[PDB]
């Protein structure tokens, strides 16, 4: 009830990390646009996922990391409190978001719903190697 004042999948498409800089955002930035949610809901984390696949040459390749957004209290780190330190997790919250789990939003079932394209408010800062 406190507000911030500065199978299963993400609801959104990923942000691909094309360079050496890791994902992070200035406080107050980074929550994807979602017209179906309200100001209380605007809080969560990005989680890094890195995939591997064998190339045409038969050698195992590692692809560029992909960062996926999950609302607070949902997803692989559903039990983590806002701001908790964990490798591959970076927290974001819009001013005025409610520090409560987003049970009413949950996660996407890819069998039933396509991902929403991840879009950020105009003017959001990104590290080098990221494009939204």
DSSP helical segment count: 0
What distance separates the N and C termini?
Answer: 31 Å
Number of domains: 1
The total strand number stands at 6
Strands across the major sheet, in which order?
A: 1-5-2-6
- Rounded to an integer in angstroms, the radius of gyration calculated over CA atoms is 15 Å
Note the quaternary state here: monomer
The geometry reads as globular
Helix content: under 10%
Strand content: 15-25%
Major β-sheet annotation: 4 strands, antiparallel
What structural class do helix, strand and pairing data support?
mainly beta
Order of H and E elements? EEEEEE
Features of the shown structure:
mainly beta, 4-stranded antiparallel sheet, two-stranded antiparallel sheet, about 130 residues, about 20% strand, about 0% helix
